[PDB]
Amino acid sequence: CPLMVKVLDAVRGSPAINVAVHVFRKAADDTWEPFASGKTSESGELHGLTTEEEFVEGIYKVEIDTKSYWKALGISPFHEHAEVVFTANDSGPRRYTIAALLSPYSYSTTAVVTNP
Amino acid sequence: PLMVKVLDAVRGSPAINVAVHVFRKAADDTWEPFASGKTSESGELHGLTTEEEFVEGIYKVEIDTKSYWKALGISPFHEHAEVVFTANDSGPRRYTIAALLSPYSYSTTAVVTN
Amino acid sequence: CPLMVKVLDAVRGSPAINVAVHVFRKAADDTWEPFASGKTSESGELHGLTTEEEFVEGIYKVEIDTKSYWKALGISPFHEHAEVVFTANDSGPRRYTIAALLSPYSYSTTAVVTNP
Amino acid sequence: PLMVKVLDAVRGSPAINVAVHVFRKAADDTWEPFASGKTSESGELHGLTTEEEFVEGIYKVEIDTKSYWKALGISPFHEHAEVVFTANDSGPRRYTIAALLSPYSYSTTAVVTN
Ligand SMILES: Cc1n[nH]c(C)c1CCCOc1ccccc1F
Numbered sequence: 242c243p244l245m246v247k248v249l250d251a252v253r254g255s256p257a258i259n260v261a262v263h264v265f266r267k268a269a270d271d272t273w274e275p276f277a278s279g280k281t282s283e284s285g286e287l288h289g290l291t292t293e294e295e296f297v298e299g300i301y302k303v304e305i306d307t308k309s310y311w312k313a314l315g316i317s318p319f320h321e322h323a324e325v326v327f328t329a330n331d332s333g334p335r336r337y338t339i340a341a342l343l344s345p346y347s348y349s350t351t352a353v354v355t356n357p
Numbered sequence: 358p359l360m361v362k363v364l365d366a367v368r369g370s371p372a373i374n375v376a377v378h379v380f381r382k383a384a385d386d387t388w389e390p391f392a393s394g395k396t397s398e399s400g401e402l403h404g405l406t407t408e409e410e411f412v413e414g415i416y417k418v419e420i421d422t423k424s425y426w427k428a429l430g431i432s433p434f435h436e437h438a439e440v441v442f443t444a445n446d447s448g449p450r451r452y453t454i455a456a457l458l459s460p461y462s463y464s465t466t467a468v469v470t471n
Numbered sequence: 472c473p474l475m476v477k478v479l480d481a482v483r484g485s486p487a488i489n490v491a492v493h494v495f496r497k498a499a500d501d502t503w504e505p506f507a508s509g510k511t512s513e514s515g516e517l518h519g520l521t522t523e524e525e526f527v528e529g530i531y532k533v534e535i536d537t538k539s540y541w542k543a544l545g546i547s548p549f550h551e552h553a554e555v556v557f558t559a560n561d562s563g564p565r566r567y568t569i570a571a572l573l574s575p576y577s578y579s580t581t582a583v584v585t586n587p
Numbered sequence: 588p589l590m591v592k593v594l595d596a597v598r599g600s601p602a603i604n605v606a607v608h609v610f611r612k613a614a615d616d617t618w619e620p621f622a623s624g625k626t627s628e629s630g631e632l633h634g635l636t637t638e639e640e641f642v643e644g645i646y647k648v649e650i651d652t653k654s655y656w657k658a659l660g661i662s663p664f665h666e667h668a669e670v671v672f673t674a675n676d677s678g679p680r681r682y683t684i685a686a687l688l689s690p691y692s693y694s695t696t697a698v699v700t701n
Pocket residue numbers: 362364455456457464465466592594683684685686687694695696697698
């Protein structure tokens with residue numbers, strides 16, 4: 242898949258399941274257009290967000306709904322969300338994995354970018 | 358009441374002269390400029406706000422990571438790093454937002470103390 | 472596999488390939504006995520370290536040879552290695568993934584623990 | 588010349604009263620005790636060594652993370668967090684080892700300055 246999101250829970254030592262993720266793409270007029278969305282699976286993964294045709298060059302924002310996740314668990318966290326913003330596909334199509342590792346007051350994120 | 362600290366995981370150093378913009382969420386859900394500055398030689402940015410001005414609300418701290426890496430001659434992944442949070446009066450009074458930067462990754466934490 | 476190690480490179484945005492990993496287990500006499508070893512694949516993964524029979528309860532140390540990795544790449548890093556030390560299987564068999572995300576002066580590690 | 592800073596990613600606070608042991612690698616490859624202490628109210632441990640004693644070599648900083656979490660009534664994954672590194676005179680002079688703790692994860696960085 243050209244875009245995959247993986248989310249882990251640093252408190253539980255587990256995938257972060259049922260995490261809402263919203264992806265936006267910056268439009269010609271500088272606003273953030275809704276691009277795709279979904280929820281992580283029981284493995285903490287979200288596949289199927291887009292296609293190689295649809296996933297054209299642009300500036301994309303992957304918003305990971307960490308507060309909704311921590312509060313669905315009955316916990317009060319620090320951040321509203323974790324946002325990951327990046328230019329994609331500007332040297333041709335690539336495959337992107339965005340990983341996030343979550344704690345109530347902290348997160349870390351990395352990208353793995355591969356050329357098919 | 359608000360401090361930002363930025364570190365460089367490639368060089369093992371403070372991240373110096375990084376632009377940081379702070380925004381407050383307005384009633385209409387847009388982000389309005391609140392505070393900004395450049396990190397110091399110690400990677401810190403102090404003096405952003407005062408207790409009087411830093412009322413409860415949703416704040417966004419945008420760290421211009423892309424320019425930092427480019428100035429070092431390194432191509433990075435992210436446009437910027439964003440830290441978005443609610444300031445809450447029933448919590449401790451001083452907020453430190455720390456970020457640890459790599460070209461394709463970052464870590465951020467909050468230290469909230471009294 | 473009951474024990475898997477995944478290593479990522481935060482500088483490259485890629486799996487960390489050809490990373491040596493040594494696993495030790497603490498003996499009755501408090502020394503660190505060699506348990507297993509291997510190298511990460513082109514996906515940054517190392518499988519096949521042990522079997523459920525062999526992977527008994529104990530205190531295990533997963534040593535990730537980060538300095539050898541960064542210097543094989545011609546780079547001078549801060550740490551000698553990254554060590555991950557944990558009690559395993561003390562409530563019965565579990566499956567462990569140890570993940571590490573590497574930079575020259577920093578690393579982060581997490582565990583995912585699942586019950587088969 | 589050596590400082591250790593420990594933060595808690597669950598509570599958003601310094602990690603207070605954490606035991607830290609520093610070791611120096613001996614000629615025979617064993618680890619010999621060098622310095623130890625407990626983090627302060629600010630999560631910091633200063634006063635470990637002096638410039639005179641902190642010669643080039645391989646050092647290990649062991650942070651007793653398991654006891655910290657247990658005292659909070661949380662079951663953690665790791666026995667401890669280990670940070671192993673070479674002190675090198677041709678590098679800057681002051682080393683700060685920072686660690687950010689969660690029950691099943693930790694992050695560590697080095698800030699080496701002059
Ligand atoms: C370890 C870590 N991973 N991710 C983050 C975010 C941090 C904390 C940043 C290091 O904190 C320091 C704070 C003040 C001075 C020196 C320091 F190294």
